[PDB]
């Protein structure tokens, strides 16, 4: 009971929400590269992937509600990837903001019983504010067994390249491919942290957005170690 049990018949769902076109907000160029990379990556990890594009804030909430009421009994885990605009604690539907808490609340240990005790992973590529990093040089709690992999630090922008995709998802998929059969998830996410921190730097004609840096933010309320192999 040091590692989560990952030998259920199915690894679980991987829900990818890919919001690209919008309100009045920028179209998120490169996000389809991200959504394809994740689909492939989690396909190899033996997740049943569901891709959904351009969802309104109502559709996001209704989708998450329905998925939380499925029977996950034969599934090891749950993964949700959110690709969109955002602010601290908030992600955007195509027609406005949704509170992250509202989404994740559906999977609470008391509200989604078939996932109680199983790791629930939320991967969020979205801004968390508008700061730039200029760089240098016998019960269980209902909030337990969640892991939030944020692309950026609280308060900060998150960077996305229009042809390569976002820095975080790029690095995330690469580290999963190289290390999912070798390393525990946190240690994979720490390598993601390093890759984004060291190998990426913004290039912009605008001085104010040029040569900026990014560090992702791992938030773990997991109670066991998580391995994708077995």
């Amino acid at each position: 009971d040091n590692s989560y049990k990952m030998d259920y018949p199915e690894m679980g769902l991987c829900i990818i929400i890919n919001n690209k076109n919008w309100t009045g907000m920028t179209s998120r160029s490169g996000t389809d590269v991200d959504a394809a990379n994740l689909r492939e990556t989690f396909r190899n990890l033996k997740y049943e992937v569901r891709n959904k594009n351009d969802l309104t804030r109502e559709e996001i909430v209704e989708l998450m509600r329905d998925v939380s009421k499925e029977d996950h009994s034969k599934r090891s885990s749950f993964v949700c990837v959110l690709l969109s605009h955002g602010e601290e604690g908030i992600i955007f539907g195509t027609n406005g903001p949704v509170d992250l808490k509202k989404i994740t609340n559906f999977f609470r240990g008391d509200r989604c019983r078939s996932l109680t005790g199983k790791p629930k992973l939320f991967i969020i590529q979205a801004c968390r504010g508008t700061e730039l990093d200029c760089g240098i040089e016998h019960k269980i709690p209902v909030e337990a067994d969640f892991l939030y992999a944020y692309s950026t630090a609280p308060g900060y922008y998150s960077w996305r390249n229009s042809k390569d995709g976002s820095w975080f998802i790029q690095s995330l998929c690469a580290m999963l491919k190289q290390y999912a059969d070798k390393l525990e998830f946190m240690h994979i996410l720490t390598r993601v942290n390093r890759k984004v921190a060291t190998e990426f730097e913004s290039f912009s004609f605008d001085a104010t957005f040029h040569a900026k840096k990014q560090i992702p933010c791992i938030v773990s309320m997991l109670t066991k170690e998580l391995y994708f192999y077995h």
Partner: peptide, 4 residues
């Protein structure tokens, strides 16, 4: 490079 763009921000989200």
């Amino acid at each position: 490079d763009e921000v989200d």
